[PDB]
Amino acid sequence: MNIFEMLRIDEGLRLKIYKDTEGYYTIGIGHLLTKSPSLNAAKSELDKAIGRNTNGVITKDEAEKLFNQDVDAAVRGILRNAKLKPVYDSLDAVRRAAAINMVFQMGETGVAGFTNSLRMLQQKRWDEAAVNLAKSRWYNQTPNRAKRVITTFRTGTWDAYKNL
Ligand SMILES: [Cl-]
Numbered sequence: 001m002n003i004f005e006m007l008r009i010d011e012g013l014r015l016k017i018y019k020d021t022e023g024y025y026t027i028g029i030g031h032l033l034t035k036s037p038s039l040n041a042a043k044s045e046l047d048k049a050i051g052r053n054t055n056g057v058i059t060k061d062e063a064e065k066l067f068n069q070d071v072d073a074a075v076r077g078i079l080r081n082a083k084l085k086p087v088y089d090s091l092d093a094v095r096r097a098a099a100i101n102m103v104f105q106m107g108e109t110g111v112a113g114f115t116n117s118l119r120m121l122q123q124k125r126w127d128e129a130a131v132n133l134a135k136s137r138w139y140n141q142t143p144n145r146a147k148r149v150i151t152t153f154r155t156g157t158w159d160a161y162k163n164l
Contacts, residue, residue, distance in 0.1 A: 001158040003071060003097040007104055009164055010145050013063060017042055017056040021142055027056075028063030030104065031070055074100050077108040084112055087122045095121070098152040105145075106138060121153065130154040 011030030017039070020026040025033045025042030033045040039056075046054050050062055058066075078084045078099060088099050102111050112118075114136070120129035130150050133139065139146040151160035 001161050003100050004067070006097055006101060006152075006158075006161055007067070007071065009161055010101065010105075010148065013060070015058055015060065015063060017046065027058060027066075029067040029070075031063070031066045070104065071100065074103040078103055081108050081112055083115075083118065084108065087118045090122045090124075092156055094156045094158065095153055098149050101149050101152075102138075105142075126154045126156075 008029055013029050014027065017025055017027050017033070020030065020032065024035050025039065025045075027033060027046055031049070033042040033049070036042065043054070043056050046056065046058070049066060050058060078088045084099075084103075088096060091099060099111075102114075114133070117129055117132045120132055123129075130153060133150050133153065134146065136146070139150070148160040152158070
């Protein structure tokens with residue numbers, strides 16, 4: 001298991017434009033295209049991302065290319081964020097994957113507002129951190145995914161993904 005396999009499980013793989021859990025146009029392995037309700041706007045974002053006129057369909061190779069870029073972007077975002085970087089640096093590699101997963105899903109700003117959870121994570125108060133993380137819109141809207149990510153933070157193991 002690693003961050004790529006982890007996010008592949010959590011996000012799935014779809015080669016045609018679809019709507020994510022929030023109703024936003026998305027493609028590949030959870031590549032958000034736009035929050036706009038316009039399909040044409042989403043197709044435009046897709047073409048710009050891929051570098052060709054796609055009309056809403058991409059290949060597996062293309063989906064994986066965007067995925068790699070997105071994972072890179074999430075890590076880079078954590079490292080450039082004053083609130084997130086110290087907490088991330090404080091973590092072991094397994095829990096770092098859980099951190100990247102969160103940022104991948106909700107963005108740097110969204111995660112950076114988990115102030116109390118972040119403190120508990122840096123303190124290595126794993127059970128307390130886990131309890132706090134679940135007190136969120138995030139957990140309520142995507143409980144099964146959040147539960148996996150939280151278990152990863154709580155245990156520092158891949159137990160929540162090992163079977164799937
Ligand atoms: Cl389409």
